[PDB]
Structure 1
Amino acid sequence: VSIPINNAGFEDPFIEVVDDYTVDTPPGWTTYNPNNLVPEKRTTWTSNNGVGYVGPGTQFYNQLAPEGRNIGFIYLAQKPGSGVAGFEQILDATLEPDTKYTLKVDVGNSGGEFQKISLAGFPGYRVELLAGDTVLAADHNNLYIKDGEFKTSTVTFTATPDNPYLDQKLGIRLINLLQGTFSGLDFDNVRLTVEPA
């Protein structure tokens, strides 16, 4: 049983040309920006985020997008250690007790080169499940993902009747840790499902 998420596979907007991309916050999401690394007005080369089309002929991946045409990316131009940024979405569903939540997202390490800049290397990722502003459970960079590949991160959480955050809105964050270069990474196919526990 799914909890609906807006633009969960970053398929909005449609992108016609393979490897073309946007540099603005994907519809349905907000830019998680606790260290002000990402500017309000972006270019190709500022710190930015957006969606990109991974299809046949892609120069960056050894497979198609995990879901549909598009993935969501986050690029950070500041040096490693400067902070983090990413995607955030607050949901209408609220944290309920005796319920087990399962968050899954695919995490992508883009390979290849862009404007003769090597994409080799990875910044590290964090996937967060939130109630309000509280990170209930999170995968802080537990998966090793090679250049050009995707892997699925899974975060689960069970709320007890005594949890302090019951009735707050559930949220998701997909974070670029900026702990290495090349300092971009991708996400796709966000899924949140729920079951009695």
Structure 2
Amino acid sequence: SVVSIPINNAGFEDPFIEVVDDYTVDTPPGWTTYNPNNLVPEKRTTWTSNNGVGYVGPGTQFYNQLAPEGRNIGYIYLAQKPGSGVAGFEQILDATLEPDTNYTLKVDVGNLAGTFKGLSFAGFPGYRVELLAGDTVLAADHNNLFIKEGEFKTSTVTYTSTAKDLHLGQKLGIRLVNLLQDKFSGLDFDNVRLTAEPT
């Protein structure tokens, strides 16, 4: 009796992108920009901090594998120096926290690799994946997985509610956070999965 909780654009497959390594600089559809330190401007260019989706295709010059799911990944790039704050993706779901339920949140996290005419993609800013109820972070994986250059790994976040959880009935949420702890200060996410199951 495992249940899949619906997530909008959970694989960042919207919008469709034709050319390999092409990307948008606007918040992916179905998601909002998590911006507690105002690191990402409201109007983005290739020159600013930004987020969006990117096509990881056959001739990719930045990865050693294809997208964990479908064609696209979601990315967050921060131009500010490390320690400046955090930013990422957030989505508030239509599902609410239910009692005596085990939640399993899985997201693939990616590390860009390579170079481009002076631009170095070596390094990784750190990630955090968090499961929300209302404004409360119920559980989070703060950068526990080592992600080699040009590869992806699946982060798993779990939370188990009791019969009397304070946040019962509040809307579930998901955040995918660029921690900006080092350079290169971009990272990818893909294949967001949330499942619920009675204890």
Kindly report which structure 2 residues correspond to 1:109-148, keeping only aligned pairs within 5 A, or say none. Answer: 109-148=111-150
Report the counterpart of residue 101 of structure 2 in structure 1.
99
**For each residue in 1:80-132, what CA deviation from the matched residue of structure 2 results, as whole angstroms up to 9, or x when unmatched?**
00000000000000001100000000000010123430000000000000000
1:141 is displaced (CA, Å) by 0.1
Q: Which runs of 4+ in 1 moved over 3 A?
A: none
Relative to structure 1, the CA distance from residue 50 to residue 20 in structure 2 (aligned partners, 3 Å threshold; closer, same or farther) is: same
- Quick one: distance in 2 between partners of 1:60 and 1:168? 40
Relative to structure 1, the CA distance from residue 29 to residue 94 in structure 2 (aligned partners, 3 Å threshold; closer, same or farther) is: same
Report the counterpart of residue 42 of structure 2 in structure 1.
40
Letter in 1 for 2:81: K
1:162 is displaced (CA, Å) by 1.7
Instruction: Report the secondary structure of 1:40's partner residue.
Output: coil
Report the counterpart of residue 155 of structure 2 in structure 1.
153
- Quick one: distance in 1 between partners of 2:171 and 2:117? 41
Instruction: Report the secondary structure of 2:85's partner residue.
Output: coil
Instruction: Report the secondary structure of 1:111's partner residue.
Output: coil
Unmatched segments (≥5 aa) in structure 2: none
Once the two structures are overlaid, the 10-residue window that deviates more, 110-119 or 54-63, is 110-119
Report the counterpart of residue 2 of structure 1 in structure 2.
4
Matched, 1:69 2:68: no
Between the two proteins, the alignment pairs up a number of residues equal to 197
Unmatched segments (≥5 aa) in structure 1: none
> How well do the aligned residues superpose, as a CA RMSD in angstroms?
0.6
Report the counterpart of residue 49 of structure 1 in structure 2.
51
- Quick one: distance in 2 between partners of 1:114 and 1:36? 28
